[PDB]
Amino acid sequence: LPCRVDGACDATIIKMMTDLNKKGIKVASVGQNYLISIPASALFADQSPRLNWASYSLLNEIAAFLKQFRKIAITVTSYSSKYVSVKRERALTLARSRVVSEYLWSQGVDSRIIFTQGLGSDKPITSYTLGGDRSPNARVEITFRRAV
Amino acid sequence: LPCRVDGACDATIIKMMTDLNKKGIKVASVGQNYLISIPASALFADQSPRLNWASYSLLNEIAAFLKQFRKIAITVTSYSSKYVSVKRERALTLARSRVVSEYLWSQGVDSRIIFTQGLGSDKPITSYTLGGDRSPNARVEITFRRAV
Amino acid sequence: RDSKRKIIRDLQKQDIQYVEYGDTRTLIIPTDKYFMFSSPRLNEICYPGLNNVIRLLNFYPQSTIYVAGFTDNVGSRSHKRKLSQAQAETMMTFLWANGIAAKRLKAEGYGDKNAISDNAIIHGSAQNRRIEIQWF
Amino acid sequence: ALKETALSVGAQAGLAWRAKIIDEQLNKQARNLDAIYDFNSLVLEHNILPPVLLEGRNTLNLADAQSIRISDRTYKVAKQAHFITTPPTWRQYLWMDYVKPEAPKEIWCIYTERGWKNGIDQANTILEENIARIKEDFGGMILYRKLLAMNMVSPPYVSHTDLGVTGDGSEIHIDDRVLRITALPELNVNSAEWRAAVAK
Amino acid sequence: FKKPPINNPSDDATIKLAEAAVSVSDSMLEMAKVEKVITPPSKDNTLTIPNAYNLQARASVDWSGPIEELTARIAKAAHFRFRVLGKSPSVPVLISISTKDESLAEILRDIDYQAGKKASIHVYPNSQVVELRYA
Amino acid sequence: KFKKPPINNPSDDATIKLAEAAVSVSDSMLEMAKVEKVITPPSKDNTLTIPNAYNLQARASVDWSGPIEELTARIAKAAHFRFRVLGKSPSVPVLISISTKDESLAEILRDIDYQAGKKASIHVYPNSQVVELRYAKI
Amino acid sequence: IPPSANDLLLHVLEGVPPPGSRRLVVSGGDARAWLSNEKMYVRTNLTILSPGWLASMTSADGTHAYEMQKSPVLLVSWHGKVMQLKVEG
Amino acid sequence: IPPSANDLLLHVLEGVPPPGSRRLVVSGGDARAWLSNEKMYVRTNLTILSPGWLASMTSADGTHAYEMQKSPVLLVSWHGKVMQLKVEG
């Protein structure tokens, strides 16, 4: 028999958003498009496109949530507080984006397309600029639209 | 009914390698090719291509193991620590090789081909050169690849 | 309890094929599960063995080291060459990063021109994709 | 008897059991399947599916004790080039059919596992044959592009003749192209005009 | 702490198929490379955008048929005079075009494109004209 | 206690016989590729027709099997390029299947153009924001 | 001289079935199929992949009609993803 | 004038059976055999020894097809070793 649920439950979904916004990693769930903004400080180290260890539980349960919808394209961008040179914050964000993108593409992706980039906080969402890599403008963001 | 085992058991095989490496005669079991290196001191006498008596229990249980695989070609080479003249260590090894090769060819060989030679430790595996025929460069070595 | 025999014991528990012979000890590496697939990128999940690799390797801290990358029978020769050199370079840079003197190191990635097993059978090809580590 | 029906109870059982199995591993490597078998890469300009060509070496038929006949080398054009609409897949060739029957003493149990094994491996052979079929296809159109590259076969020579607005006061068609494939691909016989590529 | 990849070739055939796949993909890539004849952008012969501000309007046309009437009305829409040079053939060249929001120059561009070599579009924005040239 | 190193998961005969299918057809492809690439010298690239540009160096990782135009709209909208198309689509769709991971878009266009060999073409005007798809004209 | 297409394609271009048709029970997708005379005519907007029509057809808006040989099992590509589709009757 | 070979050799050169064939159950080896019409056609790469074909055939890669009279029992040489092989049917 064909599917009621596509192997997912909305209760599990809401269990996620509750707990990960208890954990503060911010889920936007807006119109039909769904977004997660993340401080990059919890993931990359200081100016590094280099992830750490215990992060990956969180990263993979992101991908676990990403399985919860039929979807087409996933865009990831990252932003970093301006550090040295516009080339390298482009680069640092771009690498940061591409490495977590590589990881989750390797992981469960149900997208057909993943677009990836990042900019050196060229569009800071705060101008409270408390420093470098403890700023929320150091961040990484993932958008998709839940397909149908 | 056709064969599960081709008259052999892998338990017997591993009983061999355990005990003969307890006895130190070295079995390499590498990729698919299998090798035994032997100190020539236990077999030939000093600079002799001449075997002794109680060796032949060991030599024949080698051939007993050689029966354990379907195989095609067996190469034996021997090496000897450099003693007098490059001609004769070639000769001594060559004779040493050919006499144990003759013996096991007479014995159970399941090879189609036996290639045989030996060199006067022209490729010593140690350069610790403690003497003549107590060196491990005095040695004899047998390679094959277990056919399928 | 953590000696040479111990670390080779649980080395082969982590089945990285250890050769003690002569002086030239040789390590044989299943490239596949010590990589991400078809990639120069090291399977970093397989860390504790690699830690113990360097742990045992320091017990011969002067010997210079052949290492060798290996493929199987597939694709272009130029390909097999190239990918094997990628794999070679990443493990040797892994070593030079482990803190081993870069002039003790020498590498070559042979695109299957050696083949300790066959390639025409599958388990054999699995044995074929490997890395050699000779050192004296 | 009771015997043979215990066998045949097993026979279809293992057969269809196997069929369901092979169908899921088909599905999981479906990407890999066409990732191999990109047909459109092989199709032609006017989506002409190219013909399948067949290799031959040392075709020695002895006729008899008195006379033999050998080619060194031989080519068989099969399934000549044609207009295709939708290019082939593999699932056309490899998706094994699955149906489920459960429709019905120690001989019962053991001959049911007998036939269980039996249906399994006859399905495996079936599978094998399916694979071979898709081989000989794919290699065949490869060889078409080969001898076309070798000047050893001819192209599909076509004529597209076009028509403008066609039709009446109740029906029109603003542009009617009709395309006939005039001359099919075929092995040329004057080998002097061939193309023999050395490689480096 | 992380997890392994999910669709990994962790099986000794599955590896082998996977590099078989990558092998065929590259070889077909070079298949395509050696087969792919293209044109230089310096010698691509198509109509440029003639940058007149009368031509700088966005439009919408869904229509198929013979070109010269439609483009006369284009010139009329874009305040250009329209001269046609050459003879229109017995079979007219027929342009299907179905579009919703786009510039008059892009109209001229793709109808010159679908004119191909049977006809051509020349625009002189100094004297504010489109001219249809036949073969 | 002895053991060979590579201890994988159990395979099955199915994917086994698939694999030796695959390798045989693959190497026929390999020699095919050689023989065509020597019978025909490749004269020029497509990077002149597709040169790179900033914000075209964003990256993407894609699987696809469908038609071409939906896919090329998706890339042009991510690249903020206006996408236009010249010539009319044939009734049969130019179907392509790009399956790759993590390269720049310009190369993604390049292999798209190659995969739609002589049925479609990509021209890029990045002085403007133009991605244009030119159809074949038969 | 070949025929142009079906004009029943012009009917099933929109949602009318052809005269004398059987509604093929389409399960799993939005395409609707009629058995006319061994020949399903299927309307969709999706991209038909496996079986191949005798006549293909699209609307002004990309609505396809395919005068299609009989399949139990239909293939379209949806979004570069590919869908199997079952029919009944 | 003799015939060239079978063109069914060109079919069984690869792994297709001929049209209308019976899969001869090959036990003990990798060669596959079909009963076409009293005539087994056997594909192998191994070297046929005892019975002798009416037509022999090899591929580009040394794959033989042998249009072979009916044996229950087949002989090849494997590696200078020689193998008997049983068939069924």
Automatic annotation (TrEMBL), chains A, B:
<feature type="domain" description="OmpA-like">
    <location>
        <begin position="31"/>
        <end position="148"/>
    </location>
</feature>
<dbReference type="GO" id="GO:0016020">
    <property type="term" value="C:membrane"/>
</dbReference>
<keyword id="KW-0472">Membrane</keyword>
<protein>
    <submittedName>
        <fullName>LphA (DotK)</fullName>
    </submittedName>
</protein>
Automatic annotation (TrEMBL), chain C:
<keyword id="KW-0812">Transmembrane</keyword>
<keyword id="KW-1133">Transmembrane helix</keyword>
<dbReference type="GO" id="GO:0016020">
    <property type="term" value="C:membrane"/>
</dbReference>
<protein>
    <submittedName>
        <fullName>Outer membrane protein, OmpA family protein</fullName>
    </submittedName>
</protein>
<feature type="domain" description="OmpA-like">
    <location>
        <begin position="22"/>
        <end position="136"/>
    </location>
</feature>
<keyword id="KW-0472">Membrane</keyword>
From TrEMBL, chain D:
<protein>
    <submittedName>
        <fullName>DotC</fullName>
    </submittedName>
</protein>
<keyword id="KW-0732">Signal</keyword>
From TrEMBL, chain F:
<keyword id="KW-0732">Signal</keyword>
<keyword id="KW-0449">Lipoprotein</keyword>
<protein>
    <submittedName>
        <fullName>DotD</fullName>
    </submittedName>
</protein>
